[PDB]
A = this chain, B = another copy of it.
Amino acid sequence: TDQATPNLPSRDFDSTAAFYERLGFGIVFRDAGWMILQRGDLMLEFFAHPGLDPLASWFSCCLRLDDLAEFYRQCKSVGIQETSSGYPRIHAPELQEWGGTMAALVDPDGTLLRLIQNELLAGIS
C-alpha cells in the first residue's frame, strides 16, 4: 500500500510517545530527529520541534476509524480529560454540515487529531 503520512511536532520524545503508546501507537522507529508512532494501520510521524508554542501550533491530522465509540471510550478510560480549557484535551462525537459524525483529540504538544467513523465516516462539517 502506497501511503501519504501526517508530519507532526514533538518537544521531548519519551514525553510525546508515552501519551500515544497508551492509545495503541507503538514505537516502530526512533533516532533523535524523527519518531514514527503506529497503531496497526494508523501511521503518525513526529519530528523533533522544542521551539514550539502549543497555542500557535497549526498541525492537524484525521484518524479514519471503522468504529468511533472504541477509540473515544479508550481516551476516557486510559486517562485523557474531556475539557474546554486544557492540553491534553478531548471533545465528543457531533452533527454539523455533510453526512454522518466527528470527534476531537489534543496532546501535550498541541496536535489536532480529528476522529471519524468509516464510510459510515461521513462527518457533518
A→B interface (CB under 8 Å): 1-7, 28, 31, 33-34, 38-45, 47, 58-66, 98, 114, 118, 123-125
A94 to chain B, nearest CB (A): 16
The answer to whether B42 touches A125, judged by C-beta atoms less than 8 angstroms apart, is yes
Q: B61 contacts A3, CB within 8 Å?
A: no
How many copies of this chain sit in the oligomeric assembly? 2
Among candidates B3, B40, B66, B114, residue contacting A7 with C-beta atoms closer than 8 Å: B114
Interface of A is mostly: strand
Contact between B60 and A7, CB atoms less than 8 A apart: yes
| Pairwise interchain contact A2-B42, C-beta atoms closer than 8 A | yes
Q: What is the bound-complex CA distance between A55 and B124, given in angstroms?
A: 33
